[PDB]
Design a protein around this motif. Structure first.
Motif, PDB file in Angstrom:
ATOM      1  N   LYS D 142       0.859  -1.270  -0.043  1.00 25.45           N
ATOM      2  CA  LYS D 142       0.049  -0.014   0.122  1.00 25.45           C
ATOM      3  C   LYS D 142       1.022   1.173  -0.009  1.00 25.45           C
ATOM      4  CE  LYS D 142      -3.562   2.903   0.630  1.00 25.45           C
ATOM      5  NZ  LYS D 142      -3.810   3.666  -0.662  1.00 25.45           N
ATOM      6  N   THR D 143       2.209   1.203   0.634  1.00 21.43           N
ATOM      7  CA  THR D 143       3.053   2.250   0.706  1.00 21.43           C
ATOM      8  C   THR D 143       4.035   2.346  -0.724  1.00 21.43           C
ATOM      9  OG1 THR D 143       4.534   3.725   1.931  1.00 21.43           O
ATOM     10  CG2 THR D 143       4.584   1.448   2.163  1.00 21.43           C
ATOM     11  N   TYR D 147       4.390   5.476  -2.931  1.00 22.13           N
ATOM     12  CA  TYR D 147       5.364   5.950  -3.549  1.00 22.13           C
ATOM     13  C   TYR D 147       5.337   6.114  -4.862  1.00 22.13           C
ATOM     14  CZ  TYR D 147      10.260   6.901  -3.481  1.00 22.13           C
ATOM     15  OH  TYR D 147      11.725   7.540  -3.476  1.00 22.13           O
ATOM     16  N   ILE D 148       5.053   5.336  -5.674  1.00 21.70           N
ATOM     17  CA  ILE D 148       5.090   5.382  -7.000  1.00 21.70           C
ATOM     18  C   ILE D 148       4.169   6.434  -7.606  1.00 21.70           C
ATOM     19  CG2 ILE D 148       5.424   4.278  -9.145  1.00 21.70           C
ATOM     20  CD1 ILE D 148       5.932   1.760  -8.213  1.00 21.70           C
ATOM     21  N   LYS D 149       2.935   6.374  -6.777  1.00 18.48           N
ATOM     22  CA  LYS D 149       1.875   7.675  -7.139  1.00 18.48           C
ATOM     23  C   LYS D 149       2.361   8.918  -6.671  1.00 18.48           C
ATOM     24  CE  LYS D 149      -3.033   8.565  -6.037  1.00 18.48           C
ATOM     25  NZ  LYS D 149      -3.843   8.496  -4.789  1.00 18.48           N
ATOM     26  N   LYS D 150       3.301   9.006  -5.712  1.00 16.95           N
ATOM     27  CA  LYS D 150       3.668  10.262  -5.267  1.00 16.95           C
ATOM     28  C   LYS D 150       4.613  10.645  -6.142  1.00 16.95           C
ATOM     29  CE  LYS D 150       5.912  12.415  -1.226  1.00 16.95           C
ATOM     30  NZ  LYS D 150       6.654  13.638  -1.930  1.00 16.95           N
ATOM     31  N   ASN D 168      -1.128  17.576  -2.245  1.00 20.00           N
ATOM     32  CA  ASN D 168      -0.903  17.420  -0.962  1.00 20.00           C
ATOM     33  C   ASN D 168      -1.663  16.610  -0.225  1.00 20.00           C
ATOM     34  OD1 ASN D 168      -0.166  18.878   1.462  1.00 20.00           O
ATOM     35  ND2 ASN D 168      -1.674  20.104   1.666  1.00 20.00           N
ATOM     36  N   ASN D 169      -2.706  15.586  -0.617  1.00 19.13           N
ATOM     37  CA  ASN D 169      -3.156  14.628  -0.266  1.00 19.13           C
ATOM     38  C   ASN D 169      -2.290  13.341  -0.255  1.00 19.13           C
ATOM     39  OD1 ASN D 169      -5.606  13.469   1.134  1.00 19.13           O
ATOM     40  ND2 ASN D 169      -6.011  12.541  -0.469  1.00 19.13           N
ATOM     41  N   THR D 170      -1.748  13.166  -1.475  1.00 18.63           N
ATOM     42  CA  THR D 170      -1.063  11.979  -1.708  1.00 18.63           C
ATOM     43  C   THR D 170       0.428  12.226  -1.093  1.00 18.63           C
ATOM     44  OG1 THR D 170      -2.114  11.925  -4.019  1.00 18.63           O
ATOM     45  CG2 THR D 170      -0.101  10.465  -3.712  1.00 18.63           C
ATOM     46  N   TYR D 174       1.003   9.295   1.497  1.00 23.01           N
ATOM     47  CA  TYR D 174       2.235   8.515   1.679  1.00 23.01           C
ATOM     48  C   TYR D 174       2.762   8.813   3.054  1.00 23.01           C
ATOM     49  CZ  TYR D 174       6.832   7.217   1.049  1.00 23.01           C
ATOM     50  OH  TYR D 174       8.325   6.812   1.137  1.00 23.01           O
ATOM     51  N   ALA D 175       2.806   9.798   3.477  1.00 22.97           N
ATOM     52  CA  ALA D 175       3.852  10.155   4.894  1.00 22.97           C
ATOM     53  C   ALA D 175       3.057   9.440   6.151  1.00 22.97           C
ATOM     54  CB  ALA D 175       3.490  11.714   4.968  1.00 22.97           C
ATOM     55  N   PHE D 176       1.989   8.927   6.123  1.00 20.90           N
ATOM     56  CA  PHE D 176       1.365   8.187   7.175  1.00 20.90           C
ATOM     57  C   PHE D 176       1.893   6.898   6.856  1.00 20.90           C
ATOM     58  CE2 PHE D 176      -1.887   5.815   9.467  1.00 20.90           C
ATOM     59  CZ  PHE D 176      -1.461   6.244  10.665  1.00 20.90           C
ATOM     60  N   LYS D 177       1.514   6.178   5.834  1.00 15.34           N
ATOM     61  CA  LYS D 177       1.875   4.868   5.574  1.00 15.34           C
ATOM     62  C   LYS D 177       3.460   4.622   5.408  1.00 15.34           C
ATOM     63  CE  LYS D 177      -1.143   2.419   4.834  1.00 15.34           C
ATOM     64  NZ  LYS D 177      -2.117   1.751   5.857  1.00 15.34           N
TER      65      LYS D 177
END
Lengths: 229, 51, 226, 226
Positions: D142-143, D147-150, D168-170, D174-177
């Motif tokens: 999931k992260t 990561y590739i989405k970010k 900013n949502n992505t 990411y920053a939580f996962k």
């Protein structure tokens, strides 16, 4: 709980919801799920019925009743000795030596005990049902008002994601639910005048009682008399 | 007289029940392994035995 | 956990989701993956069926069962001593103590050459089909519905098909129901508080429960009268 | 780690990514780089596979294996004495002790002239093909999906094809996962805590576990009764 839990059928909650002309497409099918999502989220133990059933353990395994939700206590049928909980990772599995205290473990429709061949009494909790196979809800109009608001909160959330309700209408429904869902928690929990005597005897003890779980929590609220010398 | 006949015949004629895998399989009445040692007529027949 | 885990199937989560007219294009295929993201992110230990299985260690190595996810313990078969963890860097490698294990894939590296060990592990409960089975607990089912709602509404929000206050409300409703569902599955019951009451309240401490199968962890410690 | 590391191929992360239609131009070529940048960025020592190889030292220099990433330890093949680190500035260099090592490229610079040494190192696990092999663990997946989405949404935001609220949502999802996947792979199990429990609680402390291959690290320290 201070009040008595009188039972009413589910179409009482649709007397109240369809007073709102925005919630008129609510159904019994939509009200059955949102009642069970509510009863479980609130988790008030006075909404469930107390049932006792004896089942027989075959080989560290027993078949569990159908209507069960949660087990208060298991005991032994011959001794009355209660069982605690299985912390063992290796319960019925023997070493090649082919080699203390009763305990149990419950996952699904099966109970995993530490005893081989014995009858056990299970004090559990179920949902109280109707003539129909539907849940039967309490009569208390704090419960019925906050169930009205919960069904109104999840329906209005669906309208707000569609865009059919202004944000100040959901924000007010989420606020009015939030108070009545705490007031319903305080109503169904806070002990009676009769139930505060059972806590006055437990809390006030010159010689502490620390083994009520070995009994059926029977003398949890019993008065600890002291002789006068 | 019978318990001492148990004490003599186990000292004289006692056969060790340890298998070649080092695990006993004769299990008692509660389920645990019966561990028996070698007697005087088994410990003498390992080195210079003949038939 | 106070409640019991009565299992239900994966189409139960789509009776609940397809009530929403924006989520009408979710499948069983997408409910399968978004369930597996949700079991692992929450990581509640009640949803896993507890199985025990014996393997044969061939040469400091043995295979591992096909449905393994997480090992509770590994113990020896003949003695019963649990194997702790491999801290060594040079286990099977010879040059010119207490036993230990280390499992990476479908193989477990032990420090013992030719032995049998019992593995107590955790699996996913399957179905008549090969699909995961979910609890019917409506705190779990509601927040599993909101996880599939949030990951779908995120997808719509990046395409520009959802108001920024709509994902913000769905992220808020999940963040409460994910912490509420966590506490539903981890708060001890009356039957499991006795196993903590007898563990915590000890005049003579028991600090070697791992050599056993954590069996006597909940045993009451009785002190004689003299 | 409470769980286990079950392996899946790289394109399982492309089953997950191309559910989002703003990422449907990704390849297997693009997943290879952004995973190897990711796997290195988390730096989890559970993802890498442990191998041990005896090499020979020629004259204060040795040949290092091809799949190496990070050496756990180097020890002497005849003694078992591990090597610490080269703090010497002037290793082989004569003018007119404790063994040590220093590895820069494919060369290991030791302070012993002609010996054989065991190198416990960590490598990447691979496929039938020569491609990296990721855990199936749905927090890692999931992260790595995020990561590739970010990094794809960053390219779009620099191109001006994504609003600031979407990135900013992505960046936040990411920053939580990224912390959760860190904590999933680091927090000790019920079996790895016994490596810590027997080490923390010591009456005569052991301070020379590096001479062994960290073998007796989590061994229990028993005291006699008198």
């Amino acid at each position: 709980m201070v009040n008595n839990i009188n039972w009413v059928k589910l179409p009482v909650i649709l007397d109240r919801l369809l007073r709102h002309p925005l919630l008129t497409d609510l159904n019994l099918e939509t009200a059955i799920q949102y009642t069970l999502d509510f009863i479980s989220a609130m988790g008030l133990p006075n909404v469930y019925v107390d049932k006792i059933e004896t089942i027989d353990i075959k080989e560290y395994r027993g078949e569990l009743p159908c209507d069960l939700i949660s087990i208060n206590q298991v005991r032994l049928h011959k001794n009355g000795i209660a069982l605690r909980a299985m912390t063992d990772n290796f319960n019925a599995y023997p070493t090649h030596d082919h080699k203390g205290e009763p305990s149990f473990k419950t996952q699904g429709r099966v109970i995993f005990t530490s005893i081989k061949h014995e009858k056990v009494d299970i004090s559990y909790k179920a949902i109280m049902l109707d003539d129909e196979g539907l849940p039967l809800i309490p009569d208390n109009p704090i419960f019925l008002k906050t169930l009205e608001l919960y069904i109104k909160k999840e329906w209005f959330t669906i309208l707000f994601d569609m865009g059919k309700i202004s944000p100040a209408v959901l924000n007010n429904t989420q606020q009015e639910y939030a108070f009545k869902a705490g007031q319903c928690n305080n109503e169904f929990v806070i002990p009676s005048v009769s139930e505060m005597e059972a806590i006055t005897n437990m809390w006030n003890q010159l010689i502490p009682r620390v083994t009520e779980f070995r009994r059926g929590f029977k003398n949890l609220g019993d008065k600890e008399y002291i002789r006068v010398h | 007289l019978q318990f001492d006949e148990y004490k003599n015949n186990a000292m004289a004629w006692g056969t060790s029940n340890r298998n070649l895998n080092g695990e006993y399989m004769n299990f008692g009445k509660s389920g645990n392994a019966i561990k028996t040692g070698a007697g005087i007529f088994e410990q003498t027949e390992v080195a210079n035995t003949m038939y």
